[PDB]
């Protein structure tokens, strides 16, 4: 049915999710194996939060800011832990 | 430079993410909208757990499951 149909879109979002936020790791290892051998940290905040503002901005909902604020929060976190 | 580069990529991804997010936030809303109509329950932990298993079988890294079960969980409790 109609929401039978809705989950399947739901699986498919889920799935480009999930090769986003990997494109995501893999970019930020690149970046963290430059850093280590130039000698530079690998925790930015000023970059953290120039990230979470332009993201606030263009948010197009449905989700409040401050849940956009808090999920990338959480994956700017997995980053750090990966690097 | 390189690293500036890459951020570049970092940044088109990141919107990417929040295109994504959104969509998904959409889409449960329209299935709450039916739910509700139909007399069904919203919080569905065992679906939860449905999404959480293919995801995890799926993963292709570089992240490790825990870290991929932990965000995704993040990403359904704020789409309550
Ligand atoms: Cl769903």
Same mark, same amino acid.
């Given at each position: 049915?109609?929401?039978? $149909?809705?989950?399947?879109?739901?699986?498919?979002?889920?799935?480009?999710?999930?090769?986003?936020?990997?494109?995501?790791?893999?970019?930020?290892?690149?970046?963290?194996?430059?850093?280590?051998?130039?000698?530079?940290?690998?925790?930015?905040?000023?970059?953290?939060?120039?990230?979470?503002?332009?993201?606030? $901005?263009?948010?197009?909902?449905?989700?409040?800011?401050?849940?956009?604020?808090?999920?990338?929060?959480?994956?700017?976190?997995?980053?750090?832990?990966?690097?």
């Amino acid at each position: 049915e109609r929401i039978q $149909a809705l989950r399947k879109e739901v699986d498919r979002v889920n799935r480009e999710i999930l090769r986003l936020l990997s494109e995501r790791g893999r970019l930020v290892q690149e970046i963290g194996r430059l850093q280590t051998e130039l000698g530079l940290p690998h925790y930015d905040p000023k970059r953290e939060e120039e990230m979470l503002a332009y993201l606030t $901005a263009e948010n197009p909902g449905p989700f409040p800011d401050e849940t956009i604020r808090k999920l990338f929060k959480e994956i700017f976190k997995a980053s750090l832990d990966l690097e």
